[PDB]
């Protein structure tokens, strides 16, 4: 029984999202890649470096936005850019969110020497694909 | 704040190598000939021997960045075949898809 | 052939590279100087990225109140529990 990313059928109660409810064998088929960068094309360089950064960024986002990420992020790059699309819950006040966002942009930019400009997606509840 | 002591050691070794690399290279150049005297070569060898270990480039072992494991480590991504797999499955590496073949 | 040899020499002279004739052994040095050494490559010395920086910064953020290592929090809680207990 292979059991990597595939969330497990316990009952008919578990609410699961579309990215979360699809096994790794669907990645190209019924799913897409979350991160997007040139490194993994061939021949091309600096993949390893990128991967670490990617790993960091998601974690950072989670830390910052606690109970305010509905689903996993989408990291994008265009030359010297680092765009992020976060699906966020309408839980906290907008002012707070605004405060957070700018800070994140600045801090990340100073870290990676790359102008970040993340764009949020306010959705009241987690967008259920299956009640697994 | 590295994963374990082994990792730290490796890092240290790398640093040492970086520090003393040029000199090492020079000494190797001096050594590896049929050109020029034998005594000189011997001296060079001696010097090399004297120079501290860990500055040696061969002691540099590859591990995964995330989990400090020496084997199953792809040099393209510098991560272990467990960590890498984990990354891949969720879809956090662009390009990496399962080989339906 | 002598003429051929001469031509080769001329070519070598033109294209910078080793002019005087020599062995496969002495070319090693040349190769070395052409290359970077293995220790000076950006793959090698910067194989593991910072790590310390990553940890420390995160810790600082947590202290401030702009980030939350949930795992760290859990650990802290566990420690507290232990203290309460036995220990």
């Amino acid at each position: 029984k292979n059991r990597a990313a595939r969330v497990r059928v316990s009952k008919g109660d578990k609410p699961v999202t579309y990215e979360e409810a699809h096994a790794p064998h669907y990645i190209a088929h019924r799913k897409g890649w979350l991160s997007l960068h040139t490194g993994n094309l061939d021949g091309e360089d600096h993949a390893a470096e990128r991967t670490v950064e990617d790993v960091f960024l998601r974690k950072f986002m989670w830390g910052t936005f606690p109970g305010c990420l509905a689903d996993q992020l989408v990291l994008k790059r265009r030359g010297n850019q680092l765009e992020i699309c976060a699906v966020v819950l309408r839980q906290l006040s907008p002012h707070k969110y605004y405060f957070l966002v700018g800070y994140s942009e600045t801090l990340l930019s100073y870290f990676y020497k790359c102008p970040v400009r993340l764009h949020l997606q306010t959705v009241p509840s987690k967008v259920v694909y299956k009640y697994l | 704040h590295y994963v374990d002591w082994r990792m730290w050691r490796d890092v240290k070794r790398r640093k040492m190598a970086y520090e003393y690399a040029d000199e090492r290279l020079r000494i190797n150049s001096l050594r590896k000939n049929t050109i020029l005297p034998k005594i000189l070569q011997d001296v060079a060898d001696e010097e090399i021997a004297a120079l501290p270990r860990d500055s040696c480039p061969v002691r540099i072992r590859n591990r995964c960045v995330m989990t400090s494991r020496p084997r199953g480590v792809k040099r393209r991504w510098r991560l272990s075949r467990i960590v890498f797999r984990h990354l891949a499955d969720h879809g956090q590496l662009s390009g990496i898809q399962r080989a339906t073949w | 052939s002598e003429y051929a040899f001469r031509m080769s020499r001329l070519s070598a002279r033109l294209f910078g590279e080793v002019t005087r004739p020599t062995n496969s052994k002495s070319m090693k040095v040349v190769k070395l100087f052409s290359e970077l050494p293995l220790a000076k490559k950006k793959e090698t010395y910067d194989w593991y990225p910072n790590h310390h920086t990553y940890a420390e910064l995160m810790q600082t953020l947590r202290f401030l109140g702009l980030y939350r290592d949930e795992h760290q929090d859990f650990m802290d809680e566990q420690k507290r529990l232990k203290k309460l207990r036995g220990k």
Partner: peptide, 20 residues
Amino acid sequence: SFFTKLTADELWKGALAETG
């Protein structure tokens, strides 16, 4: 390290051990 850490849910699951 920081990369050796992970999300809370997993940790909780590990702690609980409600799946033999």
